């Protein structure tokens, strides 16, 4: 009765209330990419270090 009246009135006269996807974007964190793939620097590259190390520590093992 009143159930029917409400059911009808409610459903018909506005089903959903307005919404916009564009507005949502502002209020949510946007995807942003990691910066740089990165490559590790060549650690202790070449015998520059070795020649230095042999001389630097010619320290024996006692």
């Amino acid at each position: 009765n009143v159930i029917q009246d409400l059911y009808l009135r409610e459903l018909k006269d506005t089903k959903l209330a307005p919404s916009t996807l564009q507005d949502a974007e502002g209020n949510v964190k946007p995807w942003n990419p990691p910066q740089k793939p990165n490559l590790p620097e060549l650690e202790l590259q070449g015998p520059e270090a070795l020649k230095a190390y042999t001389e630097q520590n010619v320290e024996t093992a006692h």
């Binding site: 996807l21 995807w31 490559l39 650690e43 070449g46 015998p47 042999t54």
Partner: protein
């Protein structure tokens, strides 16, 4: 994704993730420094070994 009903951004970040999927590429940088290091180390190691072995028998 089936959680989100606003889905038109999950396809976006999915495609962005799969795009940048080799996020960081391969590295073997220890192959020039490891071999050089191995030569100096080996030379010294064998020298020490031979020296102390020699002394033992002496």
């Amino acid at each position: 994704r089936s959680v989100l009903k606003n889905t038109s951004v999950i396809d976006k970040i999915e495609s962005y993730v799969k795009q940048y999927k080799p996020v960081k590429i391969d590295a073997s940088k220890q192959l020039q420094v490891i071999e050089s290091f191995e030569k100096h180390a080996m030379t010294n190691a064998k020298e020490t070994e031979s020296l102390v072995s020699k002394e033992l028998k002496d």
